[PDB]
Amino acid sequence: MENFQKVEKIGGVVYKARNKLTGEVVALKKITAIREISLLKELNHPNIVKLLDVIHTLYLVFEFLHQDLKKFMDASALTGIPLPLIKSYLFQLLQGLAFCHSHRVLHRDLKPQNLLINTEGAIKLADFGLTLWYRAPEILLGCKYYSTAVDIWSLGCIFAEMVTRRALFPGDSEIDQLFRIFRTLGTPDEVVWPGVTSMPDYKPSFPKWARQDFSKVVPPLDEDGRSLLSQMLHYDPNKRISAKAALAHPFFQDVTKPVPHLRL
Ligand SMILES: CC(=O)Nc1nccc(-c2c(C)nc3ccccn23)n1
């Protein structure tokens, strides 16, 4: 760590830093684990933040990117992110997740704060392999052996927030999170989700709300985009669309790679 000069606090704790002798600016994270971290160094992809070095002496040295998606959404709040720029970001994240998922690795806590962007129009996943708003309902209902579907759920909540400029399900506790999901998509039962009533934290006493129309939940989104969102938010994890199959959805027929307007 004598080889690094802390520039500033970025957001254990994460620091922007300069390799005192090398030229690189980098993002430095101060934290069976050692072996797990060694499997991540080899998990390299254009939509995954690069893990440069693992220093057990345990610090993690990542590639640096200049902005997170949460701050970018706040700066675009007045006018909103142009739809072609929303569509490009979703397409790329789906590529990232498809990659992770084919090597059996989950993210588990996806959110706007850990999604990083550059001037080139690229978007990357961070915290891979290491707020309740983006949490999948199987996690809330006590399933202990949850699947890659938990990430697809989280990415759909994020898709929706970009389009509407509001958080889809902004809960401040586990039961609040759950009841907001229920009020929008209807309380789940054995019809839509087989096995649901025999989950560790399921209660037969849950209120029974009815489902709302998707044209109400994300109005300005066109029909292809609303179709894909409803398959990313299916209650049953085995019905939820996989990353690979979402990439072939007709929503991405006309996809491009626009450049964003970033003020750094
Ligand atoms: C502006 C910015 O956050 N850049 C950046 N580059 C690379 C990595 C990270 C990073 C990593 C590795 N973990 C977290 C957690 C929260 C926010 C950013 N990060 N952050």
d(CA 214, CA 29): 40
The CA-atom distances, in angstroms, between 113 and each of 27, 94, 109, 209 are 14, 17, 10, 31
Q: How far is the CA of 126 from the centre of ligand 1 (A)?
A: 7
d(CA 202, CA 19): 50
Nearest to 235 by CA among 186, 176, 202: 186
Does ligand 1 have an atom closer than 6 angstroms to the CB of 236? no
Query: Which residue's C-alpha comes closest to atom 4 of ligand 1?
Result: 65
Residue of 50, 70, 114 with the most ligand 1 atoms within 8 Å of its CB, for mutation: 114
Question: Structural domain boundaries of the chain?
Answer: 1-66, 67-260
Yes or no: is domain 1-66 CATH 3.30.200.20? yes
Residue of 7, 9, 10 with the most ligand 1 atoms within 8 Å of its CB, for mutation: 10
With beta carbons less than 8 A apart as the criterion, state whether 124 and 110 touch.
no
CATH assignment of 67-260, among 1.10.510.10, 3.40.50.970, 3.40.50.300, 2.40.420.20: 1.10.510.10
Cα angle 226, 227, 231; round to 5: 110
The CA-atom distances, in angstroms, between 169 and each of 90, 106, 146, 175 are 19, 22, 20, 12
Distance of CA 253 to the CA centre of its chain: 22
* Structure-block tokens of residue 116: 């990083």
Distance of CA 45 to the CA centre of its chain: 16
The CA-atom distances, in angstroms, between 150 and each of 105, 108, 153, 240, 262 are 12, 7, 5, 9, 30
* Structure-block tokens of residue 186: 């209807």
* Structure-block tokens of residue 230: 């409803």
With beta carbons less than 8 A apart as the criterion, state whether 156 and 233 touch.
yes
Return the SS3 of 214. Answer: helix
With beta carbons less than 8 A apart as the criterion, state whether 53 and 107 touch.
no
Nearest to 209 by CA among 175, 185, 178, 186: 186
- Ligand 1 atom index nearest CA of 71: 1
Is 34 known as a binding-site position?
Answer: no
Secondary structure of 26-75 as H, E, C letters: EEEEECCHHHHHHHHCCCCCCCECCEEEEECCCEEEEECCCEEHHHHHHH
Does ligand 1 have an atom closer than 6 angstroms to the CB of 15? no
